[PDB]
Structures are given as structure tokens and as C-alpha cells.
């Protein structure tokens, strides 16, 4: 009856940004009050809708994308942005309708000595299309000489671990991100507010 936002926002494990997770939300009641009655979210912005009116809205389907990046990169989770994350990992369309939510997760995703399980794609031949997901692990040929399955100069592996230490600067600390996409189809609305 009520939409399972707890499985998304309160999940104990989050995906790497290059392999970002998507959950479809449908046929339920959406109560976004948890976004208001909380001084814990660091980013809560919407595009195409008013963020204070979410409980008054209905949609055919809602899609929740979640992943971890570092604080300095949260600004790239927006339409028209540029950078490693927006270009190679997770890109929003220009006509994006939905909301972007983020919060500091240093207490969950950083470890003494460092947590390196979260990865991001560092090299790619071209930018992603909006909502495209690339999980390939081909050696990146930076130069003109083929690599022949061997790494070295101008032959790199495309993924790179984040280095999340508890004592990192807040810009280098891990942040958990949730992107809500609102979809309208020629069909009855199955995700409404209270």
C-alpha cells in the first residue's frame, strides 16, 4: 500500500556509481514527508515540480536511482553538468523531471585505513547518454598502439576505487545519492500522495 522508500533510502549497502542501482516504484502511496521532517539531507532539489508540493502529485511510475560518490561530485548530479561522474558514470537528461537527494554517509561508508569498495569509471571513449549504465571492464586504449590485453603506458583499466577515510575533508567524504524520476504514460497513475 505504501511505497517502499525505506528499501531505497535506508538500505545498508549502496551501489557504486558506475553500476548505479535502479528501483521501480509503482502501485503504492508515496509519503515524501520523511524528506521534510529531517535535518539530515544535504541536498534536496527538484526539477519540473515544486519540492514542497510532492505529496499533491501523481505519477504513472517512479524510478529511484541510488549510488555513492564523494561530496565534491554531488553538484554533477544535475541536468547539463560536466565532469567525470556526469560524463562517464551517471548522466541526467536536459528535460529531467524529478528530484535529487543526497546526504553525508561518512559514518557508514568510510573505514579506518580506508574503504575502497566504491568505484567510479575514470576513462571512457565517449560520454554516456542520459540514464545509460556502463559496467564494462575493457582496457582503455589512450594512445594509438593496441594494448593486446596488457596494461601499461596509455593502456589503463577504466575503473578506480574511491579512497574513503574517516578523516577525509568533507569534499572527499562519501555521500549517498537518490535520484527520483517521475514518469507519465497514457495509463492510470499508480503512485500518488496521501
Amino acid at each position: 500500500n505504501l511505497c517502499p522508500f525505506g528499501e531505497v533510502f535506508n538500505a545498508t549497502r549502496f551501489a557504486s556509481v558506475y553500476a548505479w542501482n535502479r528501483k521501480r516504484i509503482s502501485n503504492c502511496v508515496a509519503d515524501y514527508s520523511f524528506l521534510y521532517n529531517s535535518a539530515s539531507f544535504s541536498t534536496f532539489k527538484c526539477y519540473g515540480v515544486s519540492p514542497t508540493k510532492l505529496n499533491d502529485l501523481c505519477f504513472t511510475n517512479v524510478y529511484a536511482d541510488s549510488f555513492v560518490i564523494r561530496g565534491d561530485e554531488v553538484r554533477q548530479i544535475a541536468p547539463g553538468q560536466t565532469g567525470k561522474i556526469a560524463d562517464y558514470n551517471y548522466k541526467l537528461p536536459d528535460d529531467f523531471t524529478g528530484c535529487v537527494i543526497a546526504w553525508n554517509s561518512n559514518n557508514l561508508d568510510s573505514k579506518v585505513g580506508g574503504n575502497y569498495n566504491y568505484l567510479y569509471r575514470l576513462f571512457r571513449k565517449s560520454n554516456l547518454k542520459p540514464f545509460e549504465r556502463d559496467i564494462s571492464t575493457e582496457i582503455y586504449q589512450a594512445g594509438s598502439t593496441p594494448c593486446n590485453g596488457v596494461e601499461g603506458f596509455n593502456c589503463y583499466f577504466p575503473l578506480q576505487s574511491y579512497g574513503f577515510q574517516p578523516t577525509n575533508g568533507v569534499g572527499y567524504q562519501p555521500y549517498r545519492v537518490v535520484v527520483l524520476s517521475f514518469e507519465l504514460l497514457h495509463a492510470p497513475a499508480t503512485v500518488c500522495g496521501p
Partner: nanobody
């Protein structure tokens, strides 16, 4: 308390061969990318070879490709560098190096991607 201990090396003639080994203590070796660098007297430290722990790829400097072979035995916490067809320009101090536990490093040739360094082993190839 993380320690890298190397064995092998020494003096050979041109065309000879060697085998270096490097054993770690205090690390989960099976989740650590291992590497070999070298430094000639007066010159800068340069990349030689590397072997990944998760994605299996090997890495080699262009000058040693085809002559050197890097390998690893996780059960013995050991990484190996077989150096065949040695040239005089291979003379240097060779350093074993290790990245961090679970870390996925993209660029194998960058020394800053390795956190633990061995003491170094002399390799001389004359005439």
C-alpha cells in the same frame, strides 16, 4: 606492521636471466595488486610490471615486454618477476610494491598508486 621481503637478484652477463620474488606479511595478499618498479643510479624510478588481484590483468613497461613475466602465488603470499634476455640497460635497484587491500587502481604505472614498498634489490647486467 606490513612488510615486503624480496629475494633474488645479483650479477649476470648480458643474455642471462634472473627471478625476483616478494613475499608480504601483515596484508591480505589475495586482495592486493602487486607491482615491480626499478631505479637506475642517477635516473628516476620507473615502472616495470604489475599483476592485479581482482581483474586479472597484467601490466608491463614497453621496454621489458616479451622478456619479463610477472606472476603471483596467493597461497604463498608471493609475487614473482622472471627476467629473461637481460640487457645492460636493465641494471637498477628493483623495488617490490603493493597497493592497498581491496583497492582497485586504474593506472598501474603510477607509483603513487602503491602504498607499501620493499627495500630494494640490486640487479647488475654487465657488457
Amino acid at each position: 606492521e606490513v612488510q615486503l621481503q624480496a629475494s633474488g637478484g645479483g650479477l649476470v652477463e648480458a643474455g642471462g636471466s634472473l627471478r625476483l620474488s616478494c613475499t608480504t606479511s601483515g596484508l591480505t595478499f589475495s586482495s592486493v595488486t602487486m607491482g615491480w618498479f626499478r631505479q637506475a643510479p642517477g635516473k628516476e624510478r620507473e615502472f616495470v610490471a604489475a599483476i592485479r588481484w581482482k581483474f586479472g590483468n597484467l601490466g608491463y613497461a614497453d621496454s621489458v615486454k616479451g622478456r619479463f613475466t610477472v606472476s603471483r602465488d596467493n597461497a604463498k603470499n608471493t609475487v614473482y618477476l622472471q627476467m629473461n634476455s637481460l640487457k645492460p640497460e636493465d641494471t637498477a635497484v628493483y623495488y617490490c610494491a603493493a597497493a592497498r587491500v581491496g583497492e582497485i587502481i586504474a593506472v598501474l604505472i603510477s607509483p603513487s598508486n602503491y602504498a607499501y614498498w620493499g627495500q630494494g634489490t640490486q640487479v647488475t647486467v654487465s657488457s
